[PDB]
Amino acid sequence: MKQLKWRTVNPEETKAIAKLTAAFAKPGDVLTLEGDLGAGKTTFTKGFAEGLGITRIVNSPTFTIIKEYNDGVLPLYHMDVYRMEDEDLGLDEYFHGQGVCLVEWAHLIEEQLPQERLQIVIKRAGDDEREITFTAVGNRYEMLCEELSRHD
Numbered sequence: 001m002k003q004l005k006w007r008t009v010n011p012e013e014t015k016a017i018a019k020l021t022a023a024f025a026k027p028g029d030v031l032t033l034e035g036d037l038g039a040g041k042t043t044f045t046k047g048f049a050e051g052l053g054i055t056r057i058v059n060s061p062t063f064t065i066i067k068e069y070n071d072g073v074l075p076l077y078h079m080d081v082y083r084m085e086d087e088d089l090g091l092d093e094y095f096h097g098q099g100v101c102l103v104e105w106a107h108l109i110e111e112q113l114p115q116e117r118l119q120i121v122i123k124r125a126g127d128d129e130r131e132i133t134f135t136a137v138g139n140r141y142e143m144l145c146e147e148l149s150r151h152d
């Protein structure tokens with residue numbers, strides 16, 4: 001309900017968690033993603049997009065900050081603020097829009113984030129092994145983790 005944890009040994013397992021998470025996404029959800037470069041934040045997003053029914057490739061949006069995908073069952077607003085110091089962008093319309101936001105490196109703009117979010121931390125744990133921790137902030141995300149673990 002408040003925290004969930006997984007360990008994965010390949011990118012497909014990481015996408016599989018994200019795929020399932022997307023079944024419980026609702027308009028206005030904001031998911032944050034943290035971890036090293038190469039940890040798997042964008043890989044997670046690729047599986048999340050599969051879960052929403054998006055067929056086109058979902059690649060790292062590092063050099064545009066934001067990428068929109070509208071063909072899924074819910075609009076996906078994929079963000080990476082790694083390069084924000086070089087970018088105003090009005091991320092607020094997306095955060096409180098009718099889609100779902102996945103925000104890589106979100107803590108770099110902590111003060112612009114909505115107070116409530118689902119925080120996803122991807123930690124390296126050996127070669128192709130990752131440890132993924134969901135931390136729910138807000139009743140909505142406690143609700144979401146409730147459903148996810150029940151159907152997990």
Ligand SMILES: Nc1ncnc2c1ncn2[C@@H]1O[C@H](COP(=O)(O)OP(=O)(O)O)[C@@H](O)[C@H]1O
Pocket residue numbers: 008009010011012013014035036037038039040041042043044060104127128129130
């Ligand atoms: N268990 C795993 N989960 C996610 N990615 C993995 C895993 N094992 C190896 N990888 C590889 O690590 C890289 C992660 O890339 P990416 O998702 O772009 O990282 P980030 O967005 O966090 O910088 C990919 O090349 C992926 O193939």
Ligand SMILES: [Mg+2]
Pocket residue numbers: 041042043060080104
């Ligand atoms: Mg990335």
